[PDB]
């Protein structure tokens, strides 16, 4: 039983449409445990259409 498992479960219904949901989840866990402060935002800065988001998920 997990805490980000529920985070991911939340994004089952509605995809967060222009970031890949799965990389985000590890990112927030990395962000809170690996505690790099910029990365999640930077990850999004690099992130720069439904198809492209799908590709983002596959690559991860």
């Amino acid at each position: 039983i997990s805490v980000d498992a529920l985070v991911q479960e939340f994004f089952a219904q509605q995809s967060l449409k222009i970031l890949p949901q799965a990389p985000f989840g590890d990112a927030v866990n990395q962000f809170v445990s690996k505690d790099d402060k910029h990365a999640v935002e930077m990850f999004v800065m690099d992130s720069l259409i439904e198809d492209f988001r799908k590709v983002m998920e596959k690559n991860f």
Binding site: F10, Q14, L16, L19, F24, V44
Partner: peptide, 12 residues
């Protein structure tokens, strides 16, 4: 796109 994502992430 970012605003939709951010609301979603915080809510999650």
């Amino acid at each position: 796109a970012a605003i939709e994502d951010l609301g979603r992430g915080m809510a999650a």
